[PDB]
């Protein structure tokens, strides 16, 4: 190929019906060029998008997908070829293939159409990789390459002039597995030249070369045409449509690929979200309506969370959900790690349109930014970049949300200008007396905490080395532990001398309380005139 | 001013082997289509 110039740690995850790729297979995310390569449309396209161009300045990281579908390829059967294509769902209806004969030289050519796409690549002169010329004086120049009967492969390749064999070169395992080593060896001949082809590249492994039968040379560039070992080469590696095998290769016409299905909507999404589960993920949000998939959302990230790799989750409400509706949402799904959206607006997206947007866009587009924040920062007042806010909810009511524990956003108008900020970071559950469940920065830092805490102890007792291990050396590796975290301004303080063990063997039982970097939320203010 | 400006945060390159791919984003300097004018004609008197 040519050399040419041409013109967080936190992971976020998602989950929809995607229009492009193979189904049932989770995808490394990075760029929306390669999710506008990859995918063509769907919510989720729109949600990987949103979720980089989602604050003004923060965004989403790596992002990891799957398509949800029961899908199949489009494919058709004709010779002794079944045409097959890479994409899934009844798009892959409108696939147009075919084969024609060139007039050059009795060559294959294949012309991959998809006129929706203006796509129109060309594989041209399949087929014909080297010319045989004869110059001998006899009476005429015969030659064979045969197949084997039982699987059609050749075998040999045999010069025969008048009627008697000057050379062969025989393919049965010796040194010519490759076409190549047979030109070198046709040109040491006083008779006969042998020339590749100068159509491309068409170096060709020996064992897929075809019948020849007595053709004559003598006055013809007879070209050994290996129609199916140059198909692969050329069709197999490249474009949409590639051809399987199954009778002969045979032309045929202007054909339209049928079998293509997108499939419905299944009624569990948990068999699908599993699929996530050793792939490293931390925020993750669905998008489908029913509140049976969040149901299983919120069960994954407490089955990852007891395998040990706690996850959070957020959940949208649609088109204009209201408190009645809020209110037997959120107490069906009343545990922690979950989070419910209560408000829906307006995005103007980075493809130009305007469009209306379901609260699980919203609930995409605050999973980005919080993945976006750092470590422990919360999201908490910060913008989210929406355009319009369809919100009929007044300073009081949404104390009763933030009671509730349901996540809403509030119009701030300063003097004269207006911008959207989220009012709080409550999660889902309601009862406010434990703070690393109520809200959701406070628990992110405690995951992580534990998380590092127990990757250390992986080495330091965990490799049980000895019977000396005191519990005396257990309370010190602790406070060095908390030592490192409150230097860094990861923990606020700790208690200087109350760390405590329980030793007995390889078995020791630990406990320990530490001070958070606790968040400031409440000003009240008495203004006061004389004069 | 050939280039109005450009959002450096939205650039971006990723690098596999002996190859480099980059996104980026320009704003073109924006042409000017169309004016239309409402001209309206009064009167007012003139005094001596």
Same mark, same amino acid.
């Given at each position: ?47 990987? &998008? ?114 008697? &064999? ?46 020849? &039968? ?185 104390? &009763? ?131 | ?20 791919? #980059? ?5 073109? #300097? ?19």
């Amino acid at each position: 190929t040519r050399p040419h110039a041409s013109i967080s740690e936190k992971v976020f995850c998602l989950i929809g019906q995607a229009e492009g790729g193979e189904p049932n297979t989770v995808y490394e995310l990075r760029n929306y060029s390669q999710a506008k390569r990859l995918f063509r449309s769907g919510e989720l396209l729109d949600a990987i &998008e949103l979720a980089w161009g989602s604050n003004p300045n923060y965004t989403a990281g790596r992002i990891l997908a799957m398509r949800i579908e029961d899908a199949k390829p489009a494919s058709a059967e004709i010779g002794g070829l079944k045409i097959t294509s890479k994409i899934y769902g009844n798009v892959a209806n409108n696939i147009q293939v075919g084969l024609e004969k060139n007039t050059l030289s009795d060559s294959l050519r294949l012309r991959v159409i998809f006129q929706d796409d203006r796509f129109n690549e060309v594989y041209d002169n399949i087929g014909n990789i080297f010319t045989i010329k004869y110059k001998g004086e006899e009476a005429n120049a015969t030659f064979s390459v045969e197949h084997d009967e039982e699987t059609q492969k050749a075998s040999r390749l045999v010069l025969k002039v008048g009627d008697q &064999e000057v050379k062969s070169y025989d393919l049965t395992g010796g040194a010519y597995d490759y076409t190549n080593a047979i030109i070198t060896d046709i040109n040491q001949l006083p008779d006969f030249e042998a020339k590749l082809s100068p159509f491309g590249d068409k170096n060709l492994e020996s064992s897929k070369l075809d019948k020849i &039968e007595n053709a004559n040379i003598k006055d013809k560039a007879v070209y050994v045409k290996a129609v199916f070992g140059d198909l692969e080469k050329q069709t197999a590696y490249n474009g949409i449509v590639s051809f399987e095998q199954l009778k002969t290769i045979e032309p045929f016409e202007l054909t339209k690929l049928k079998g293509g299905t997108n499939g419905e909507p299944p009624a569990t999404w948990a068999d699908k979200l599993d699929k996530f589960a050793h792939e490293g993920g931390y925020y993750i949000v669905p998008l489908s309506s029913k509140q049976s998939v969040h149901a299983e959302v919120a069960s994954f990230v407490k089955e990852r969370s007891d395998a040990g790799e706690p996850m959070r989750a957020i959940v949208g409400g649609g088109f204009n959900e209201s408190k009645e509706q809020l209110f037997g949402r959120q107490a069906s799904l009343s545990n922690p790690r979950v989070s419910l959206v209560a408000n829906s607006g307006t995005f103007v997206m980075d493809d130009g349109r305007k469009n209306h947007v379901p609260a699980y866009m919203v609930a995409v587009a605050l999973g980005g930014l919080a993945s976006g924040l750092e470590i422990g920062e919360s999201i908490t007042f910060k913008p989210l970049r929406v355009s319009s806010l369809d919100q009929i909810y007044e300073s009081i009511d949404l104390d &009763e949300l933030n009671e509730n524990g349901i996540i809403s956003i509030e119009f701030v108008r300063n003097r004269t200008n207006t911008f959207f900020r989220i009012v709080d970071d409550v999660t889902t559950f309601n009862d406010k007396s434990d703070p690393v469940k109520a809200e959701m920065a406070v628990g992110e830092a405690n995951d992580f905490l534990v998380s590092e805490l127990k990757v250390q102890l992986e080495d330091q007792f965990i490799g049980t080395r000895t019977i000396n291990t005191s519990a005396s050396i257990i309370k010190d590796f602790i406070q060095s532990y908390l030592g490192r975290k409150k230097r860094d301004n990861e923990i606020q303080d700790f208690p200087a001398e109350d760390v405590q063990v329980i030793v007995e063997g390889n078995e020791a039982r630990i406990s320990m309380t530490v001070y958070p970097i606790r968040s400031f939320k409440k000003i009240s203010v008495s203004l006061v005139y004389k004069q | 001013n050939e280039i109005q400006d450009f959002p450096a945060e939205d650039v971006q390159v990723i690098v596999e082997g002996n190859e480099a791919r #980059i996104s980026m984003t320009v704003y073109p #300097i924006r042409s000017f289509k169309k004016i239309s004018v409402s001209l309206v004609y009064k009167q007012q008197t003139l005094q001596a």
